[PDB]
């Protein structure tokens, strides 16, 4: 089935068992106090190595405290870092994966001041804790504080710190070393003409901008020797106006190859300061592969690997078969499913837990200096935790799950995996719940992969799925289970609005279930994520859509990474929006609003969608109580409205805790 993905490859002298690479992932799992590798990190990367990845890259480790850009970033500075690095490499290597250590000083994106650092020694001098760059400047992004200009001595010291970092990985058993020269971190800052305004030998011409990187590579190569795998990450496109051209990145890569033997090029898209789309659901698998083509026709000798929304085995298989890339590189697909390569090579892609590019647990949690998580994978950051271990139940119990939404299905899946006799009762004709409604939204197309995954799991695990079956007190009693799991989800709220009883008033459920005929003008009351995604579905159909929000902002519950994605779509679909509006009443011809400035305006509508929020659909739970079965639990939105991340996590936690005694 995936002959090309499962084909081996030589990276330097090292034979890699397949063409699947798990990319560097800072996750805030290392010791926040000192940058040491701890059990949370070890077990996280061990799961990717057990999952079958031919290559497993560590997260980018800082080379100096000023280069620390994440609260729990791994450190590559002191002798006290060595024991942890050895444990990490042992764990990856034992599984048969090629361990690769990444070196990443975050430069302009450093946040040492936020990590209890009040001063540091840099270039033999006492300095403040501010980020460093080739040129003293500010960021368009408020998360990044103004940087200080590195002295030539600090530059020389950082080259040596990179050599020492590579020495540290090699002495602790890592199979190779990766230089992170991307996305706006220190090296990328010297490479880009946007960040590098130096007039000495470290800036000006492209040759000078590349010097810091070249000297780092030359130094590492001399340190580790000729036989040791030296790989690197470099941008193919920075998506920065006034940055380097795509062709300049190729010239830099050519300078790299001429300086040292590069054993693998990982090619990347954008900077953290880039406004445009790079990693979102706006980009589909293969949307960036033309860049890999240009590197190949430019004559780059080293094998190439590429990630960046490559979440499909079929797309990667073709890309590798056609020689566009030599290795399928991935980060978020490996967060979502650490066993993706094992599934690809055993010919079961239907078992893949696909990353939907939600950017919640991964990007967003890491950037707000929180412990990384994953929406679709509740095990992320918990592989090391005994409370998340999946253990066979000795005494099989009869488990009745009410509701085939994500929380119900994840619970049923885990309870069946552990050996319980599981039944799902679902009132509609199909599984998915609100995920089955959301999949209709333009940016939620990868939610069909979540449906496909759970549909295939129910089948394989022998879960008794009872579709078109509304669970009642009587049908639960007839079933007589040992454990009743209520996972009936949420329902649209009914706020106290004048004229809410109008015929014009509908809800997000009736829209997505096709239970309402919509006109040419559709007006949404509510500016939350659910209201916006439904409005995008209504607008895609070529309808005139207005979103009215009483609060200060629309998309208020949408993480920073998805905000711009929604702006682009709303503009593209000619969607109108109003904020700080008072909803006065709903009537026959639309909705009467009063702006924050005092303007009374009539919003013309053929349909009024009241989408201010969701209530817990807890009628069944209130009707049956806690005594209808020996064990009664409520999970997901029926236990209190949260979102998809919490529903899936509640399901996993419910599924693992169902005891056998
Ligand atoms: C259009 C849309 C877009 C969304 N977008 C996002 C997003 O981007 N990110 C995010 O975090 N969240 C989003 N959400 C919310 C998210 O989908 C929900 O939080 C989540 O699906 C709730 O999971 P659940 O298992 O608790 O309930 P549900 O998904 O609501 O499932 C409940 C299930 O129980 C069934 N059922 C109900 N009563 C009975 C009964 N008595 N007997 C049998 N079956 C019954 C229902 O038919 C349904 O299948 C969105 C929701 C919608 C509708
Ligand atoms: C939480 C998170 C942390 C990341 N940490 C790193 C890092 O340590 N070093 C690095 O070079 N890239 C890092 N990246 C970039 C990824 O390795 C990857 O190239 C990117 O997410 C695009 O690939 P994908 O679509 O497979 O996720 C990070 C990405 C995420 C989601
Ligand atoms: S949190 Fe969302 S984007 Fe990140 S790995 Fe999980 S499914 Fe993918």
DSSP letter for each residue of 434-495 = HHHHHTTSGGGTTHHHHHHHHHHHHHHTT-EEETT----HHHHHHH--SEEEE---EEE---
Q: Ligand 2 centre and the CA of 444: distance in Å?
A: 21
Per-residue DSSP letter, 587: E
- Under DSSP, is residue 169 helix (H, G, I), strand (E, B) or coil? helix
> Using only C-alpha atoms, what is the Rg of the chain?
27
- Under DSSP, is residue 630 helix (H, G, I), strand (E, B) or coil? coil
Q: Ligand 1 centre and the CA of 488: distance in Å?
A: 8
Residue 366 — φ and ψ, nearest 5°?
Answer: -65, -40
- Under DSSP, is residue 225 helix (H, G, I), strand (E, B) or coil? coil
Q: Ligand 3 centre and the CA of 99: distance in Å?
A: 23
Please indicate if the annotation marks 59 as binding a ligand: no
Please indicate if the annotation marks 309 as binding a ligand: yes
Among 277, 377, 372, CA closest to 651: 377
Structure tokens at 221: 């190569």
Per-residue DSSP letter, 383: T
Please answer whether residues 636 and 412 qualify as being in contact, where contact means their C-beta atoms are separated by less than 8 angstroms: no
CA distance readout (Å), 135 to 107, 112, 242, 534, 605: 11, 18, 15, 45, 54
Atom of ligand 3 nearest to the CA of 377: 6
Structure tokens at 77: 């500075």
- Under DSSP, is residue 558 helix (H, G, I), strand (E, B) or coil? coil
Please indicate if the annotation marks 312 as binding a ligand: no
C-alpha–C-alpha distance, residues 27 and 59, integer Å: 8
Instruction: Please indicate whether the domains covering 9-386 and 505-615 agree at the CATH topology level.
Output: no
Q: Which residues line ligand 3 (CB under 6 A)?
A: 332, 335-336, 355-362, 374-377
Method: X-ray
C-alpha–C-alpha distance, residues 92 and 35, integer Å: 19
Per-residue DSSP letter, 81: G
H or E element at residue 103: strand 98-103
Please answer whether residues 176 and 224 qualify as being in contact, where contact means their C-beta atoms are separated by less than 8 angstroms: no
Half-sphere exposure of 232 (CA within 13 A, CB side): 27
User: Yes or no: is domain 505-615 CATH 3.40.50.150?
Assistant: no
H or E element at residue 48: helix 39-50
C-alpha–C-alpha distance, residues 100 and 412, integer Å: 37
Please answer whether residues 81 and 35 qualify as being in contact, where contact means their C-beta atoms are separated by less than 8 angstroms: yes
Residue 553 — φ and ψ, nearest 5°?
Answer: -140, 150
Q: Is 487 in the pocket of ligand 1 (CB under 6 A)?
A: yes
Which ligand is located closest to the Cα atom of residue 468?
1
Domain ranges, ordered by start, for the chain: 9-386, 505-615
Q: Ligand 2 centre and the CA of 279: distance in Å?
A: 10
Give the length of the chain: 661
Half-sphere exposure of 223 (CA within 13 A, CB side): 22
Structure tokens at 207: 């040759």
Strands 607-610 and 505-506: parallel
Q: What sign does the dihedral 138-363-645-516 (CA atoms) show? A: positive
For the purposes of burial, counting CB atoms within 10 Å of the CB of 400, is it exposed (0-12), middle (13-18) or buried (19 or more)?
buried
C-alpha–C-alpha distance, residues 38 and 49, integer Å: 17
Residue nearest atom 31 of ligand 1, based on CA coordinates: 405
Please indicate if the annotation marks 638 as binding a ligand: no
What resolution, expressed in A, was reported for this entry? 2.2
Q: Could you tell me where the DSSP H helices lie in 203-339? A: 206-209, 211-224, 246-259, 289-297, 313-321, 332-336
Please indicate if the annotation marks 70 as binding a ligand: no
C-alpha–C-alpha distance, residues 331 and 382, integer Å: 18
Site to probe by mutation for ligand 2, drawn from 25, 73, 313, 356 as the one with most ligand atoms within 8 Å of Cβ, is 25
- Under DSSP, is residue 330 helix (H, G, I), strand (E, B) or coil? strand
Multiple choice CATH, 9-386, 3.20.20.70, 3.10.20.30, 3.30.930.10, 3.40.50.800: 3.20.20.70
Q: Ligand 1 centre and the CA of 425: distance in Å?
A: 15
Please answer whether residues 320 and 19 qualify as being in contact, where contact means their C-beta atoms are separated by less than 8 angstroms: yes
Q: Which residues line ligand 2 (CB under 6 A)?
A: 23-27, 59-60, 102, 104, 180, 182, 233, 268, 279, 307-309, 330-333, 362-363, 366, 372
Structure tokens at 155: 């530059």
Residue nearest atom 2 of ligand 3, based on CA coordinates: 358
Residue nearest atom 7 of ligand 3, based on CA coordinates: 355
Token pair 């209504």 is found at: 538
Site to probe by mutation for ligand 2, drawn from 21, 24, 61, 560 as the one with most ligand atoms within 8 Å of Cβ, is 24
Atom of ligand 3 nearest to the CA of 332: 5
Q: What sign does the dihedral 532-538-540-545 (CA atoms) show? A: negative
Which ligand is located closest to the Cα atom of residue 311?
2
Site to probe by mutation for ligand 2, drawn from 22, 181, 279, 331 as the one with most ligand atoms within 8 Å of Cβ, is 331
Residue nearest atom 19 of ligand 1, based on CA coordinates: 643
C-alpha–C-alpha distance, residues 21 and 26, integer Å: 16
Please indicate if the annotation marks 644 as binding a ligand: yes
CA distance readout (Å), 28 to 36, 44, 185: 11, 11, 17
CA distance readout (Å), 128 to 96, 117, 131, 189, 545: 44, 9, 9, 20, 51
Q: Ligand 1 centre and the CA of 162: distance in Å?
A: 49
For the purposes of burial, counting CB atoms within 10 Å of the CB of 363, is it exposed (0-12), middle (13-18) or buried (19 or more)?
buried
Number of Cβ within a 10 Å radius of residue 171:
11
Helix axes 246-259, 289-297, angle to 10 degrees: 50
Strand partners, 327: 305
Which ligand is located closest to the Cα atom of residue 357?
3
What torsion do the CA atoms of 160, 161, 167, 170 make, to the nearest 10 degrees?
-140
Atom of ligand 3 nearest to the CA of 362: 4
Please indicate if the annotation marks 24 as binding a ligand: yes
Residue 124 — φ and ψ, nearest 5°?
Answer: 70, 20
Angle at 274 between CA 271 and CA 280, to 5 degrees: 90
Site to probe by mutation for ligand 1, drawn from 364, 405, 458, 533 as the one with most ligand atoms within 8 Å of Cβ, is 405
Number of Cβ within a 10 Å radius of residue 627:
7
Please indicate if the annotation marks 30 as binding a ligand: no
Please indicate if the annotation marks 43 as binding a ligand: no
Q: Ligand 1 centre and the CA of 408: distance in Å?
A: 10
Q: Which residues contact 255 (CB under 8 A, 6 or more apart)?
A: 207, 210, 214
Per-residue DSSP letter, 297: H
Token pair 């996590």 is found at: 649
Q: Ligand 3 centre and the CA of 377: distance in Å?
A: 8
């Amino acid at each position: 089935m995936y002959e090309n993905l499962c084909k081996p490859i030589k990276i330097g002298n090292h034979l890699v068992k397949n063409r699947m690479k798990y990319a560097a992932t800072v996750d805030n799992f290392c010791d926040t106090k000192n940058g040491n590798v701890i059990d949370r990190e070890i077990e996280y990367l061990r799961e990717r190595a057990k999952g079958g990845f031919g290559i497993v890259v560590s997260q980018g480790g800082y080379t100096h405290i000023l280069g620390k850009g994440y609260v729990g970033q791994m450190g590559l500075v002191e002798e006290s870092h060595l024991p942890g690095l050895k444990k990490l490499a042992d764990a990856i290597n034992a599984e048969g994966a090629m361990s690769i250590g990444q070196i990443m000083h975050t430069g302009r994106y450093g946040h040492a001041h936020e990590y209890g650092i009040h001063e540091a020694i840099a270039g033999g001098k006492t300095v403040g804790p501010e980020p460093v760059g080739p040129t003293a400047m500010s960021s368009p992004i408020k998360r990044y504080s103004p940087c200080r200009e590195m002295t030539p001595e600090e530059i020389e010291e950082q080259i040596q710190a990179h050599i020492v970092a590579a020495r540290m990985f090699k002495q602790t058993g890592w199979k190779g070393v990766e230089v992170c020269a991307i996305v706006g971190y220190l090296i990328a800052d010297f490479l880009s003409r946007w960040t590098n305004k130096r007039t000495d030998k470290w800036g000006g011409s492209l040759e000078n901008r590349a010097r810091f990187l070249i000297e780092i590579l030359k130094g590492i190569r001399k340190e580790v020797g000729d036989d040791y795998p030296l790989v690197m990450r470099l941008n193919s496109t920075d998506l920065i106006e006034g940055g380097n051209t795509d062709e300049e990145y190729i010239e830099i890569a050519k300078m790299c190859e001429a300086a040292v033997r590069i054993d693998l090029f990982s090619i990347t898209v954008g900077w953290h300061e880039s406004p445009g789309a790079a990693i979102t659901a706006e980009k589909r698998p293969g949307d960036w592969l033309h860049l890999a083509d240009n590197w190949k026709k430019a004559g780059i000798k080293a094998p190439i690997c590429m990630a960046y929304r490559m979440n499909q085995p079929d797309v990667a298989e073709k890309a590798v078969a056609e020689g566009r890339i030599d290795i399928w590189e991935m980060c978020r697909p490996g967060i979502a499913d650490p066993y993706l390569p094992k599934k690809v090579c055993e010919g079961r892609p239907e078992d893949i837990v696909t990353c939907t590019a939600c950017n919640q647990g991964c990007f967003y949690y890491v950037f707000i200096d929180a412990i990384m998580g994953c929406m679709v994978n509740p095990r992320v950051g918990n592989e090391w935790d005994p409370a998340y271990a999946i253990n066979p139940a000795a005494k099989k119990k009869k488990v009745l799950v009410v509701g085939a939404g994500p929380s119900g299905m994840e619970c049923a899946r885990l309870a069946a995996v552990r050996g319980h006799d599981v039944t799902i009762m679902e009132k509609s004709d199909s599984i998915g719940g609100e995920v089955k409604l959301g999949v209709k939204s333009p940016l939620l197309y990868d939610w069909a992969e979540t449906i496909r995954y759970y549909k295939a799991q129910i089948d394989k695990l022998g879960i008794k799925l009872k579709l078109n079956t509304e669970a009642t007190a009587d049908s639960i009693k007839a079933e007589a289970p040992d454990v009743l799991v209520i996972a009936t989800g949420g329902k649209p709220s009914r706020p106290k609005i004048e004229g809410i009883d109008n015929k014009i008033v509908t809800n997000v459920f009736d829209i997505l279930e096709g239970k309402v005929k919509l006109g040419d003008k559709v007006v949404f009351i509510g500016g939350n994520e659910i209201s916006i995604q439904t409005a995008e579905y209504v607008a895609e159909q070529g309808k005139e859509v207005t979103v009215l929000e009483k609060g200060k902002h629309i998309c208020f519950d949408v993480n920073i990474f998805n905000i711009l994605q929604h702006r682009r779509l709303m503009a593209k679909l000619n969607m109108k929006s109003m904020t700080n509006v008072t909803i006065n009443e709903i009537n026959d011809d639309g909705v009467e609003i009063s702006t924050a400035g005092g303007k009374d305006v009539t919003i013309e509508a053929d349909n009024v969608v009241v989408a201010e929020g969701m209530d817990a659909d807890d009628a069944l739970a209130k009707a049956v109580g806690t005594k209808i079965a020996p064990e009664v639990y409520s999970i997901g939105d029926c236990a209190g409205v949260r979102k998809l991340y919490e529903a899936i996590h509640d399901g996993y936690k419910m599924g693992v805790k169902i005891r056998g005694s």
